[PDB]
Write a protein that binds this ligand. Structure first.
Ligand code: CA
Ligand code: CA
Lengths: 73, 66, 62, 63
């Protein structure tokens, strides 16, 4: 039994160590996910002016096409 | 008893492996998003360049039709 | 205790599946962003050339 | 005491896993929305490429 007593306490200790490692891992995962969400928000805030730049280019190029056609007539 | 202790230990070890996998996935997600942030920086810079080029070009075309 | 642990394992596995899907989504985001990167570079080049040509036209027709 | 720490650690972990589930879902929805926006931007970019190519060709012909 004492063989199994000491083996059992060994396994219990290793299990506790495992739960402690789990806690540090999930805390790291939470920080990583929050950082990811922050980066995604900032990148979307850059995407917005990109879409508006596309629209601005489209509008201006319509205007320029009209001007060019008038120049050649 | 020993059977219950061994079973619970193996369960905790596999749960830790699963948690390790989830952690690795969160970390890789963060890294991928940062990497893509670099490409979005380049996209925004080039689009600003093109917007300004086109504004000046259309100003010139309007001036030409004057 | 054992049941608690099985349920925690189930939780972790569900989140793992969700994050696998998210990784697929963000890899497709990477592909889209690479294509848009190329397009934006080519676009500012074309716009630069058209700017030069528009200035020349400004001179020529005024 | 070891049993108490193990049990409370497991409960804490479970709570943080709930948090991570919420974060993963939000992450996926934000990425879907941004993929849609990037598709819109790519379409506008194709249109602009075509418009600028044709405008360059025309201006070159007129010079
Ligand atoms: Ca946005
Ligand atoms: Ca800038």
């Amino acid at each position: 039994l004492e063989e199994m007593q000491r083996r059992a306490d060994q396994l219990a200790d290793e299990s506790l160590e495992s739960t402690r490692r789990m806690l540090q891992l999930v805390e790291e995962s939470k920080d990583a996910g929050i950082r990811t969400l922050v980066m995604l928000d900032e990148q979307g805030e850059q995407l917005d002016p990109v879409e508006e730049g596309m629209n601005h280019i489209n509008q201006d190029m319509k205007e320029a096409e009209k001007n060019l056609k008038d120049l050649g007539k | 008893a020993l059977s219950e202790i061994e079973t619970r230990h193996s369960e905790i070890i596999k749960l830790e492996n699963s948690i390790r996998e989830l952690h690795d996935m969160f970390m890789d997600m963060a890294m991928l998003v940062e990497s893509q942030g670099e490409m979005i920086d380049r996209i925004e810079y080039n689009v600003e360049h093109a917007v300004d080029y086109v504004e000046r070009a259309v100003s010139d075309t309007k001036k030409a039709v004057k | 205790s054992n049941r608690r642990l099985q349920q925690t394992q189930a939780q972790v596995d569900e989140v793992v599946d969700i994050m696998r899907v998210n990784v697929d989504k963000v890899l497709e985001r990477d592909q889209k962003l690479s294509e848009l990167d190329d397009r934006a570079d080519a676009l500012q080049a074309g716009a630069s050339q058209f700017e030069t040509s528009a200035a020349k036209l400004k001179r020529k027709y005024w | 005491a070891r049993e108490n720490e193990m049990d409370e650690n497991l409960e804490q972990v479970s709570g943080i896993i709930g948090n991570l589930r919420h974060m993963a879902l939000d992450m996926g929805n934000e990425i879907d929305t941004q993929n849609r926006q990037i598709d819109r931007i790519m379409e506008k970019a194709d249109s602009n490429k075509t418009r600028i190519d044709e405008a360059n060709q025309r201006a070159t012909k007129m010079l």
